[PDB]
C-alpha cells in the first residue's frame, strides 16, 4: 500500500506548482476534495495565520493533516490545532527546536533531503559525485539526529527532496535507485509532482517546458513506478491521477 | 522502444471511446496532431468512402497509417491509398481473403485475439478456464494460419484483444502475464485505451463509471507497465499521455 499525500498550498505564489488556496474556504474545499479523491494525508503548506485555520477545519473534518514547515513554532501551532504529521523540508536542520518538538509530540516526521552548498545558495544545485550515496548518507545522519532527540525511528519518513539543490539528472538517478533507499527500512516518500524536471522532460517541440498542469500524467507514472519499487508514499497535486495510477498497478500486479 | 499507435475513429458513434472524426478535415487534423504528439502509427478505423480519403491524406503527409478493418476489400483499398499496416480485429478470421492480401502486400498485420462462443454473440464474454493460455494458443494458431497464407512471420503483430468477449478480470490476467505473450517472440500490441474495464476500475464513489475522457491516466500507466514488460506497442486515444508515460519510464529506467 502506498500513501497518497495531497498538496494544499495555502500561500499565494505566482510560480506555484499547484493551486493557491489562500482563501480559507477554497483551501478547505480543496483539502476535502483531495481526501475524497483518495489522499490519505493532506499536506498544508504556507505563516501561522494562514495555515492554522485550514489545518483546524480539515482536522475537524477527520482528515489526516501534515504541516509542511521548517519552523518548530508553526509546527507546534499546527499540532495544537489537529495536525498529525510534520513535513520538514529542512530535515530538522533549519530548526533545532524541531526534533524536541517531534519527540514531544510522537507523530510522524518527514525528513526531506536538502543539502545546500551554502545557506545563501539553497537552490544552486549541488555538484554530487554520487547523489544516491550522498543523499542516503545525509538522510541516515538526519535520522540519527532525530533519534538522538528522543524521536522514535518508527515515526520517521525519508524523502530524497527531488529538485532541491538537485538537477533533473540527479532526480532520475535517485528514482532509478529508489530500491536502495527503500532498503534502509525507513519509509520513503517521493515528491516529484509537477516539478521542473518534468517540465523539462516533457518540453514541447520548440523547447518550451510543459506547463505545470500538463505534468500530471508523468507525475502519476512516477507514482506507479514508486509503488512498484516499495515507496511508502507519494506527495502530489493531482490526487485522482496518482490514485488512478495506483489502482492500475494493483490491478495489474495482483492479477493472479 | 515502444510504438505508439494513435486511434483515429472516422465513424460517427454515440458510444465512441474517443472522438468521432467523420469530417475529413477534422480527422486529418487529428491524425497529424497525434503524429506530432509522438504517435509513430495512426490507426484509421471506419466504410471505404469514409476512411480512404483520410488514409490518403495522412499517407501523403508522410504518416505511417494502419487500417483498422476486418474486410480484405477495405484493407486493399487502404493499401492502394498509402496505408502501411493492416490492423485486423478478427485476426484474419472474418475474411479468408485477408491473409492472401497480406501475403501479397508484405506489410505488417496485427492479429487481434477475439474468440467468440458464436458469431451471433461476439460480445458475450467467453468463459475461460485459463484465459492467458487460451489466448496464447489462439493467437499462435492465427499466426500459423497467416504463415500458411504466405505471410512472413516477421510482419506479424499479436494483440490479446482486451475487452473483446473478455471481462475486466480476464483483462487484468492477460496484462499480468504480458511477459508470457511477449515470450512468443512475436511483437505484442496492447489496446487497453479507455476501455470499459478502466471505467469500472475507476468508478466513482457512487459506482458510476469513470467517463471515457477520464480513463487516460490509467491508460498511460498501462502504457508504462507495458513498456516495462516488453510490449512492442500501445494503441491509444490520448497520445500525449502515453508518450509522457513512456518518456518517464525511459528516464527512470535509464538513470545509470
Ligand atoms: N516532503 C516533501 N515536501 C515538499 N514540500 C514542498 C515541495 C515543493 O512542492 P511544490 O511543487 O508544491 O512547490 N516539495 C516537497 C517534497 O518534494 N517533499
Ligand atoms: N489491434 C487492436 N485494434 C482495436 N481496434 C478497435 C478497438 C476498440 O477501440 P476503441 O476503444 O476506439 O472503440 N480495440 C482494438 C484493440 O484493442 N486492439
Ligand atoms: Mg504547490
Ligand atoms: Mg475510439
DSSP A85-146: EEEETTTTSS-TTHHHHHHHH---EEEE----S-TT-TTSPP--SSHHHHHHHHHHHHHHHH
Burial A118-134 (b: 16+ CB within 10 A, else e): eeeeeeebbebeebbee
In angstroms, the Cα distances linking B167 to B115, B135, B171, B214 are 13, 13, 6, 20
Ligand 1 close to Cβ of residue A223 (< 6 A): no
Query: Cα–Cα distance between A87 and A93 in angstroms, integer?
Result: 13
- Tracing cell 478505423 back to the chain, one arrives at B45
Buried b or exposed e, range A47-56, using 16+ CB within 10 angstroms = ebebbbbbbb
Question: CB of A184 within 8 A of CB of A140?
Answer: yes
Domain boundaries, given as residue ranges, for chain B: 1-256
What are the C-alpha distances in Å from B39 to residues A91, A169, B209, B232, B242?
43, 26, 28, 13, 9
Q: How far apart are CA A152 and CA A103, in angstroms?
A: 7
b/e for B43-54, b at 16 or more Cβ within 10 A? bbbbebebbbbb
Binding-site annotation: residue ranges of B for Mg(2+): 9
* Ligand with minimal distance to A68 CA: 1
**Cα dihedral A50/A55/A58/A60 (nearest 10):** -120
Beta carbons of B142 and B111 less than 8 angstroms apart: yes
User: What CATH number should be reported for the domain whose range is B1-256?
Assistant: 3.20.20.20
Cβ of residue A159 lying under 6 Å from some atom of ligand 1: yes
- Find the CB nearest A256 among B173, B249, B252: B173
Q: Which of B12, B14, B34, B89 gets mutated to test ligand 2 (max ligand atoms within 8 A of its CB)?
A: B89
Instruction: Give the three-state DSSP class for A76.
Output: helix
**Cβ contact B244–A205 (<8 Å):** no
Q: Are A82 and A55 in contact (CB under 8 A)?
A: yes
Question: Any idea what the Cα angle at residue A243 is, between residues A238 and A248, rounded to 5°?
Answer: 135
What are the residues facing B67 on neighbouring strands? B44, B86
Running DSSP on this structure, what letter comes out for residue B188? B
Interface residues on B facing A, Cβ-Cβ cutoff 8 A: 36, 169, 172-173, 175-177, 201-202, 205, 216-218, 220-222, 224-225, 240-241, 244-245, 247-249, 251-256
What are phi and psi for residue B114, nearest 5 degrees? -160, 95
Helix A72-80 crosses helix A48-60 at what angle (to 10 degrees)? 30
Cα separation, B11 vs B50, whole angstroms: 8
Residue B59 in grid coordinates = 499517407
How many residues would you count in chain B? 256
| CA B221-B227-B233 angle, 5° bins | 100
Distances (CA, A) of A149 to A91, A136, A152, A188: 13, 20, 9, 21
Ligand 2: residues with CB < 6 A are B 7, 9, 17-18, 68, 87, 89, 110, 112, 159, 161-162, 189, 191, 193-195, 235
**What's the CA gap between A14 and A8, in Å, rounded?**
15
Adjacency order of strands within the sheet including A3-9: A156-159, A109-112, A85-88, A65-68, A41-45, A3-9, A233-236, A189-190
* Cell numbers placing A125: 544545485
Resolution (A): 1.7
CA B164 to chain centre: 12
What's the CA gap between A19 and A43, in Å, rounded?
13
Written as nine digits, the cell of B198 is 478502466
Nearest Cα neighbor of B32 from B77, B2, B62 is B62
Nine-digit cell string for A252: 495489474
**Which residues of chain A make contact with B241, given a CB cutoff of 8 A?**
217
Strand pairing report for A156-159 and B65-68: unpaired
- Residues A79 and A71: their CA atoms lie apart, in Å, by 12
CA–CA distance, B109 with B151 (Å, rounded to integer): 9
d(CA A42, CA A31): 6
How far apart (Å, rounded) are the C-alpha atoms in residues B43 and B87? Answer: 8
H helix or E strand, kind and range, residue B114:
none
Q: How far is Cα A141 from Cα A166, in angstroms, rounded to an integer?
A: 19
Distance between CA atoms of residues A29 and A144, nearest Å: 38
Q: How was this structure determined?
A: X-ray
Helix residue ranges, H only, chain B:
24-36, 48-60, 72-80, 98-105, 131-148, 168-176, 178-182, 196-201, 216-228, 239-253
Cell of A147: 533519534
Residue partners of A240: CB distance under 8 A and separation at least 6? A37, A38, B217
Consecutive H or E run containing A175: helix A168-176
The rounded distance, in Å, linking the Cα atoms of A235 and A160 is 12
Nearest Cα to Cα of residue A167 among A130, A124, A109: A124
Atom number, ligand 1, closest to the C-alpha of residue A194: 11
Burial B181-190 (b: 16+ CB within 10 A, else e): bbeeebbbbb
Cell of A8: 494544499
- Collect all residues of chain B within an 8 Å Cβ-Cβ radius of residue A201: 247-248, 251
**Greatest pairwise CA separation for chain A in angstroms:** 54
A15 is written with which cell numbers?
A: 510560480
Please list, in sequence order, all residues whose beta carbon lies within 8 angstroms of the beta carbon of residue B14, skipping any fewer than 6 positions away.
Answer: none
Q: Which residues of A touch B224 (CB under 8 A)?
A: 221, 224-225
Task: Name every residue whose Cβ is closer than 8 Å to that of residue A207 and which is 6 or more positions away in sequence.
Answer: none
A interface with B, Cβ–Cβ < 8 A, is 36, 169, 172-173, 175-177, 201-202, 205, 216-218, 220-222, 224-225, 240-241, 244-245, 247-249, 251-256
Main-chain dihedrals φ then ψ at residue B72, nearest 5 degrees: -55, -35
Amino acid at each position: 500500500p502506498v500513501q497518497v499525500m495531497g498538496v494544499l498550498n495555502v500561500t499565494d505564489d505566482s510560480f506555484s506548482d499547484g493551486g493557491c488556496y489562500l482563501d480559507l474556504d477554497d483551501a478547505v474545499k480543496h483539502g476535502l476534495a483531495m481526501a475524497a479523491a483518495g489522499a490519505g494525508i493532506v499536506d498544508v503548506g504556507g505563516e501561522t495565520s494562514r495555515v492554522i485555520p485550514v489545518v483546524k477545519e480539515l482536522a475537524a473534518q477527520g482528515i489526516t493533516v501534515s504541516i509542511d514547515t521548517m519552523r518548530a513554532d508553526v509546527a507546534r501551532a499546527a499540532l495544537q490545532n489537529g495536525a498529525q504529521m510534520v513535513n520538514d523540508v529542512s530535515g530538522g536542520r533549519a530548526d533545532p527546536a524541531m526534533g524536541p518538538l517531534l519527540a514531544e509530540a510522537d507523530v510522524p516526521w518527514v525528513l526531506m533531503h536538502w543539502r545546500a552548498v551554502s545557506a545563501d545558495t539553497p537552490h544552486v544545485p549541488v555538484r554530487y559525485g554520487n547523489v544516491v550515496a550522498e543523499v542516503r548518507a545525509d538522510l541516515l545522519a538526519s535520522v540519527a539526529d532525530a533519534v538522538a532527540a528522543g524521536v522514535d525511528p518508527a515515526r520517521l519518513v525519508l524523502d530524497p527532496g527531488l529538485g532541491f539543490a538537485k538537477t533533473a539528472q540527479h532526480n532520475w538517478a535517485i528514482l532509478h535507485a529508489l530500491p536502495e533507499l527503500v532498503a534502509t527500512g525507513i519509509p520513503v516518500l517521493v515528491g516529484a509532482s509537477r516539478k521542473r524536471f518534468l517540465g523539462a522532460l516533457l518540453a514541447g517541440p520548440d523547447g518550451v517546458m510543459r506547463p505545470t498542469d500538463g505534468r500530471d500524467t508523468a507525475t502519476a507514472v512516477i507514482s506507479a513506478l514508486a509503488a512498484l519499487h516499495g515507496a511508502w508514499g507519494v506527495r502530489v497535486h493531482d490526487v485522482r491521477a496518482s490514485v488512478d495510477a495506483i489502482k492500475v498497478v494493483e490491478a495489474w500486479m495482483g492479477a493472479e
